[PDB]
Amino acid sequence: PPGPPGFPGDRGLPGPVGPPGPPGPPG
Amino acid sequence: PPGPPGFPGDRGLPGPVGPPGPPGPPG
Amino acid sequence: PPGPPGFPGDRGLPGPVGPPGPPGPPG
Secondary structure (H helix, E strand, O other): OOOOOOOOOOOOOOOOOOOOOOOOOOO | OOOOOOOOOOOOOOOOOOOOOOOOOOO | OOOOOOOOOOOOOOOOOOOOOOOOOOO
16 A cells, blocks of 8 residues: 655745845934 | 655645834934 | 655754944044
């Protein structure tokens, strides 16, 4: 008889860090 | 006897890029 | 026969927030 389903996979890697933000308000 | 368990699932796909940084400090 | 493949892993989490932007214009 056929075996049972394989074990579910691991969660993926986290995404990369986001890019830098934009310039702040004028002084 | 039944066959072996199936092959393990693949790791999930990488997550999306993180959000852009917040605005900088005042000038 | 071996069982079917395992369910694929769930997608990774979004990355953390990017660095703060630079200081704003001198104004």
